[PDB]
Amino acid sequence: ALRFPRFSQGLAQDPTTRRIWFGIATAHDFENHDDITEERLYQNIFASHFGQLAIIFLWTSGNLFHVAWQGNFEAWVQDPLHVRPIAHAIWDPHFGQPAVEAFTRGGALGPVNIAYSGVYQWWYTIGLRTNGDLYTGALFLLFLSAISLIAGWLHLQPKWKPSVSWFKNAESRLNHHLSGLFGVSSLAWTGHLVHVAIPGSRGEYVRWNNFLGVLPHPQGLGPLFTGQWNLYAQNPDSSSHLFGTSQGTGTAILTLLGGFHPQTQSLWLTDIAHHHLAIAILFLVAGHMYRTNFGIGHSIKDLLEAHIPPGGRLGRGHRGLYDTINNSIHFQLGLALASLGVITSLVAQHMYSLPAYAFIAQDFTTQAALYTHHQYIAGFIMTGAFAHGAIFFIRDYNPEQNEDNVLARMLDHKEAIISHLSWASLFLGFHTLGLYVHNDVMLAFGTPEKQILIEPIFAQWIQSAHGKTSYGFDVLLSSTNSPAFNAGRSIWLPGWLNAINENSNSLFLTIGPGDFLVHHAIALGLHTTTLILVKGALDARGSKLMPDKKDFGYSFPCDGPGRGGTCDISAWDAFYLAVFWMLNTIGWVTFYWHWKHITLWQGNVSQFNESSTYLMGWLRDYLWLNSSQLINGYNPFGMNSLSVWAWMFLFGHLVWATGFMFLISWRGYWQELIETLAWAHERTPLANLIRWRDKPVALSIVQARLVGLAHFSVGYIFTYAAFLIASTSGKFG
């Protein structure tokens, strides 16, 4: 109440140095603050949301302004395939003359940084052609950040403070989010695509000054209200159209052509506009489901209570789930995080096979970086979902009010789920490792023909069903005569089949015996991570070794050396163990993607197909072969533009190796060392005039585990990012 941690007196009373650490650690945990209530917690959450929105808007404004000021957008838009984008300028007093000479890239007059984020292509596609547009966007986003901060401060005031009953109005929030946040935004983006992006792609410059004097379609709004909507698709863009000019163009604004643009190998803008229009219509129609003040609609609690199967195979069914979900925030956070993780993984998997930006398929480094970034974010989010589920089970679960519903039945039979997850993980790991080792030994002895190679029959059948004729099966779309082929032939199949049956693109790549083992390894990683997280979540309330785990809290060090010793027994430790497996699985996935695509780009796909079946192939033909240019960033003879990537490589190695300190060595040794150091400082002359205010103590156990995990993650991420970017940029292919 007096020291720095004003939100907790217990953290302010103690005189050691752990007060600072734990004050910084638990600043955002609004439930543990003293004299807290529901209203204060909800209002603080609202204010934090507003602050976060302001931060995001400021970030994007800064990006836009820096690209506008120190970039070469105007020179890039003319020659997209022969100009390297510039992120921002470099000013550094520590730079030597060769460093200044080597880093001067592009058309600039000094050192710059090549942008691998890929914002240039996005801004070019959405219809920006000069730096004035970028400056205007920067000013607009600055204004948005300012108004967000102002709104947050206004809603923290006593007069405009909402009440708890307002926050729990679920039906109104769902209706407004499904109708206003989603549908209306998609409709407005469709309007932008029709009004600015599509005409800007045909050479017509539409801006704020003169967007009222131009007609997006010569007919106007007549066809839309008459009923002859087909007039909006009469004249599609010709197959010889050139992006950004008025040669071989059309007048349609809504089509269903499918496939890719011939020149840019990207999706047509008309298809995107049509998709957004349809999605907006669907959301607007679907947003009127729930009851509100007007006396019609649906009630969620009655929907849940009515779904109970006769015969009692599910018990009480869904009775009492509404109040359980509403009264607890961790349930909502877990659901939102799981959905966001699945959506992020979908985005990562889709944006590389069906690119939507002009001249992005020809930029390999951008694609690789975006895929890796989104996959890592998805993994972290998916881990957080289970962490918050476990927190909910610890804190907000009331056993009496959820009697015999689905949650109680889940807590009843955790043993079967855990056992079956363990069996599946053991099976997959055993057999995948066995096959890999057998292939490796067979290659080692010099006889490759004794290998075990299994064709992925089911996936190839799926690809043949989609319309690929590279295997031999004739099913569904592959067959010339079929109900599906006939039904869909008149609209989108002519473009889709041509797009899928080419060899340059990444749409449904050919797969062989090498992909089978990698897919099984990915499945093994998913199963093991799920096992760890599910065990941690289900065994949070109690077990046989400690049947009162809910009293100690979510995170606590241990329970002493008795009963055989109980280390890492809490759910926090289960999450801390599952983070490693998440990192390992994501690393496997990224390695597979990077190697497959680099072998495809370099020209020959036989190298992967012949060296991916044994582990020495991965170790020799992927890492060792591709590190040659990366490790040569600086040498005794000189240096080149790849020096910073090698430096960050070594930096990541050092941080990853430093993590082992905190992950292996434990507290007592360091506490004794601090004892001795304190004596030494107190007993020396000319230095005892200075005295400490906080008694130095060694770090706690959970804090040390967290620090070690953070070091591990930082080193992992930095090392892989450096390797990927340097290796893909060295050859540009």
Partner: peptide, 30 residues
């Protein structure tokens, strides 16, 4: 122009020094 030559030292050195001094004073203050 030469804006970086003025702005980089400010963000790099002066502002972190002010922030560290203020934060240490606020941490140790009773």
């Amino acid at each position: 122009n030469n804006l970086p030559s003025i702005f980089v030292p400010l963000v790099g050195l002066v502002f972190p020094a002010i922030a560290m001094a203020s934060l240490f004073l606020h941490i140790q203050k009773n």
